[model samples]
Target: KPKVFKLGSSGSDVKSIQDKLNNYGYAITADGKFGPSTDWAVRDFQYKHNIAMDGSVSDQTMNLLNQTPTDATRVNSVIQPDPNPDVQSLKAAAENLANSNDTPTYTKFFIITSLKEQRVYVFNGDPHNWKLINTFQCTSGASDTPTITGRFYVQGKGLAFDVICKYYTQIQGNYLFHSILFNVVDGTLGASLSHGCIRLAVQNAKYIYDTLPMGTGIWIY
Candidate 1:
């Protein structure tokens, strides 16, 4: 019998789940680690398939996921080759910044947000070198209220706003990195949905809030 896999789970089992989710048109990375993206995908899959919607891979969910044939058109539409040709250059630039002696010692974490990809990359280490720690699927501000671009430093953390959002990390002024609006009736991930803040999954938001310190560098482009 297959074991249960839920949030915080990792390893081959999680990777298998991710692969199955991708087959069904969920554009989650098959990165082995069961993070926010996986959680959301699992919930969405459950909801669509009339499962429990518990965001966990139990016997029934796993059975269904394994039995379902891959939808070629859906997979082809969603899983394209890397669209961002500049990604390597971006990583090289980050390495350059990490190697620069002028970079502050206190700057232990570096974040890059790609508006076009709707993704956030997190790195850790001082000026010496940085290693990719995590990658998250996020939703940035809508067209009318676009997210601010360019470099910014994390100002501080904020609490939930009237139960609408939680684990808010102030990016600059009113702009923030926060959890998706829980108050919304049927909010979904992936796309421009927020007013101006970068909306992440609840776990991702909490991770950023708890891990990233003040003055951490965030580059949005």
Candidate 2:
């Protein structure tokens, strides 16, 4: 029987696939192990080629892969978000509003947190003319210890806390945006497990700590 490379499958065939994917701009390691990154790359390749995005390498996918030239310009194709038409329209509308002359000027940098979305959005310019610059997934406080919601300002920043969290930036009294708890031990993302602080990935928290100046406006909802 022919080999069908999918998640968990490993060997020379997987390595071949990984090499081809890398040639086409996927940066996954050619370790001969079909892992999550490989799976994502396969799906992304299929999406780009209008093929069945099943993340399985079979006859059709293999044929197409062999036909496609190794193009360096395709690098990071998997990392880019799908360009949705609705999202494009919404972004255009926002840009138009931002460019309007009547928009009120508020602050240079603003941060907004959505507990429901479990995401943080950073914007530049005033409130009415804000341009989204960055976004990060976050783990806010658990239900019993909910993150405080309201307008606040970034009060201070620190390198580490209790030898656990890192790159902590104070949001309000005791609440903060910091690295995941015990990252040195067993921290994970996308969970409501923190005490009251907004937990972000270490690199993301570091970016906020380094880039966002003290006294930046923050709105939590």
Candidate 3:
């Protein structure tokens, strides 16, 4: 069977899709709507892949969405979010988010899960980094509008600007993580709950601030 990730599951998903399509030179707003603009994107994507432009999602299209954008597959496609949920799952995700309280941990890469515990983790380097750096109890997006699951690179950093409680911005117009005015006690809940940011508590944010490099890996499922 063909694989599938998700689309418009959250504002972040929409933003990611829009930004990628835009970056690929597709003229469309990151409005989070699977409307005409998105339709065009899908058709264009298929056409470029030599897929018949039937204005529908065929097996090849589904397969494309179900996996990460590899060099070969994406040569004719845009760099939108990986359509595969299996790429990053709560079970496969690192439990490092639970170590949000600990400190002085050395790590290079990290992954989180909003479904199981709505938490984030810091790893030493790779997924096998079972050192248990730290964990953050985060609140993620509610049912239906869930946090996107896929691979993405760290985009930007800043304090809570005009935004709500989020501080990080993975993409230019997308919010990532930040401290919130409320919910200091239950911080890990910031998973898919924000407009799109990965939502982190002040403590977790600080640790990430000191630990992660500019282009760290972030994946959730």
Candidate 4:
């Protein structure tokens, strides 16, 4: 029988999906557990395939999954220089945001985060035509914690984030741009799991910490 797959469903079907995703250039662990990584992988595949992108496996999705060919080049293939599976949707969102807009009279470098998209966008200093420098996978607060969404600025920085986060940059009171918890149990990046703070990868957090200044704007929507 063909086992089912979902956010919580596991077993051979999950492993099969994981294998297919990894084979198709999604760098996810084929551990047979349909965790956040698996969810994102399916969503990304759906996005690329122009499907529903609900991250759930059904008869239609199964058929399409079998037919879709993996293209390794598009993974993290950034704007101009680049742009993933378990990572593609985030990568796609990054690229989509890289195509910046026309605006004036604002900070040279600014940050924009989309909670629904689960991604963060970084724009380089250009008043007339802004250039996107980076886009990163991130996690916002959960329902209970509920991340505050609005326009803000880099408030402060700490050598280390509370408990597990490192390379922290304060945004508002307790909110921040910080590295995702090194402790895996806390949660995964690219999903909603934080306590109202924006969580990013170590490299991403470091990049933001080293580059963006105190006055840099953070627009969350």
Best by lDDT: 1
Query: What's every prediction's RMSD, in angstroms?
Result: 13.0, 16.9, 15.7, 17.7
lDDT of 2 at 23: 76
Q: Give candidate 1 regions above 4 Å deviation.
A: 1-105, 183-193
Candidate 3: tens digits of C-alpha lDDT, residues 133-185? 45566655555455666655454455555225534435224535556534343
For 31-148, candidate 1 gives per-residue lDDT tens digits of 9998866776676566556567677898898888887554422222111112345445456654554465333322456677789989887666655676556667898887778899
lDDT scores in order: 0.69, 0.69, 0.48, 0.66
lDDT head-to-head 2 vs 3, winner = 2
- Model 3, stretches more than 4 Å misplaced? 1-107, 127-130, 162-166, 169-175, 182-193
How much does candidate 3 score in TM-score?
Answer: 0.42
Residue-wise lDDT of candidate 4 within 29-136, one digit each (tens)?
798999866776676566556667677887777886676564522232122311423334444454445345332212346677889988877765444344567676
The clash tally of candidate 4 reads: 8
Model 1 poorest ten-residue lDDT run? 72-81
